[PDB]
């Protein structure tokens, strides 16, 4: 239908989650669906065990990738009244949240209610300090864009020249944690490849190495983010306290699972 | 040594090099509270709306992190370190007593 403009005047949809996590979930769910489809082709009573193995493997892989790309390592959230925009003395009541990941920081500003001052307050901004990316340039672009005051404040808190040294320590921690997680993912790939080979011992040792590298990434992130001097984040009349987020605990449980699986495989081989 | 300059200038004749001001050009008490919000938070104690002070309430907290106060060594005695440098809004506030 024509004769009117625009042809599609409806609001343009927004993706309801992170695209990298969604893509990882979709790929691994497709693999799981294919394996479930071929499951009756797995002959004998082994299939159950097979199913478990397959699921475990996929989960591990997915977890690693998700944990490498999720900004859920250092999370914090407060409910505050704060100034919203320039040339306006009105304040907004909103939840302000910090989500520090390996490659950057996601600052969330969700209005309570979302519709305040005739504006939609559901900001989720990203500021990346990955190698080759200039954090100061991104903060300057955010300033020129005119982001709300809490977002600009939390972004300036992580600038390289800010008085509190969160930028350097967090960048180092995220970089080396991501490197260790990539090593763990490569070890997971090698373990999956070598478990099909007749030598199951090397596959078990590779799975144990995957768990070890996940735990090493955890330890490096903790040690590098703990050495920072206390940086007080004060918004409105409240203070934002950060803590290890869901990504940290997912990495912990996945690394422990891999370590235990490799140890059990080695012990079972030694005993049998 | 030459000072900081605007990165968008200083490459072609029609746009010669222009220096960049390292503090806010406004007369907005930046030498008292700092030229950034993080600087202000570093200068604040977040108690009773007062600027942070050390053991003596009449003096602000000593600069501890190296990103806060200019630490030019003492020309007379060669003393270095922020052990005796107070934290102000201006980075070079301890140039002279």
């Amino acid at each position: 239908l024509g004769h009117t403009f625009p042809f599609y005047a409806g609001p343009k949809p927004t993706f309801p989650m992170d695209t990298t996590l969604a893509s990882i979930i979709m790929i691994f769910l497709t693999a799981l669906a294919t394996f479930i489809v071929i499951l009756p082709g797995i002959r004998g009573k082994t299939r159950l065990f097979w199913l478990l193995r397959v699921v475990t493997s996929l989960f591990i892989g997915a977890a690693i990738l998700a944990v490498n790309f999720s900004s859920e390592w250092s999370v914090g959230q407060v409910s505050t009244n704060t100034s919203y925009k320039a040339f306006s003395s009105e304040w907004i009541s909103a939840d302000i949240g910090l989500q520090v990941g390996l490659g950057g920081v996601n600052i969330t500003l969700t209005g309570t209610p979302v519709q305040q001052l005739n504006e939609t307050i559901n900001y989720n901004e990203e500021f990346t300090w990955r190698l080759g990316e200039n954090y100061a340039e991104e903060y300057a672009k955010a300033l020129e864009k005119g982001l709300p005051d809490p977002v600009l404040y939390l972004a300036e808190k992580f600038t390289p020249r800010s008085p509190c040294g969160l930028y350097r320590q967090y960048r180092l921690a995220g970089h080396y944690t991501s490197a260790m997680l990539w090593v763990a993912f490569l070890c997971w790939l090698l373990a999956n490849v070598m478990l099909s080979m007749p030598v199951l011992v090397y596959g078990g040792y590779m799975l144990l190495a995957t768990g070890i590298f996940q735990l090493l990434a955890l330890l490096f992130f903790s040690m590098a983010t703990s050495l920072t001097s206390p940086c007080p984040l004060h918004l409105g009349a409240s203070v934002l306290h950060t803590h290890h987020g869901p990504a940290f605990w997912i990495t912990l449980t996945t690394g422990l699972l891999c370590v235990l699986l490799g140890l059990a495989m080695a012990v079972a081989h030694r005993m049998q | 040594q030459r000072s900081r300059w605007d990165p968008e200038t200083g490459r072609s004749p029609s746009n010669p090099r222009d220096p960049a001001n390292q503090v806010t050009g406004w007369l907005d008490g930046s030498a008292i509270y700092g030229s950034s919000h993080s600087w202000s938070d570093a200068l604040r104690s977040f108690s009773r709306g007062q600027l942070a002070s050390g053991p003596d309430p009449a003096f602000p907290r000593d600069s501890q992190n190296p990103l806060l106060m200019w630490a030019a060594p003492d020309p007379a005695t060669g003393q270095n370190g922020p052990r005796g440098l107070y934290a102000f809004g201006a980075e070079r506030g301890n140039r002279e007593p």
């Binding site: 100034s83 003395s89 300033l143 | 960049a20």
Partner: peptide, 28 residues
Amino acid sequence: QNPISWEVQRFDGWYNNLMEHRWGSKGS
């Protein structure tokens, strides 16, 4: 009521002018 009834001045000098946000700002 909110004791802060005015628009708090920014420490970095940004958004002081309505159309020239970088006027008087740090680094300008």
